[PDB]
Amino acid sequence: GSSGSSGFEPRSLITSDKGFVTMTLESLEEIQDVSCAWKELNRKLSSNAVSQITRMCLLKGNMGVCFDVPTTESERLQAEWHDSDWILSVPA
């Protein structure tokens, strides 16, 4: 409802073991199901690259998605993201 911004400034962990990385995609409003996100991603990413997306789940609030990708494709994904209203981030 009406609270202070949820983002905050949490403590930075000692990054070391570069294994996998998680991604987030914020929506404008609610969506139908993951099909919305998948259809969009398929129109903004290549079949080859989009296949790296795993564990795509609906965020708590249906206002975006959360998924995992390799640390290599993570930068390509970030650069290839354009021409869409959705915001792309990579949290801790």
Domains of the chain: 17-92 (3.30.70.2280)
CA distance 25 to 88: 5
**Determination technique for this PDB entry?**
NMR
> Which of these, 70, 86, 77, 71, lies nearest to 37 by C-alpha position?
86
Element (H, E) at 42: helix 34-44
Q: Which two tokens stand for residue 71?
A: 């640390």
Q: Which residue has the tokens 């962990």?
A: 13
> In 3D, which of 53, 66, 64 has the Cα closest to residue 92?
66
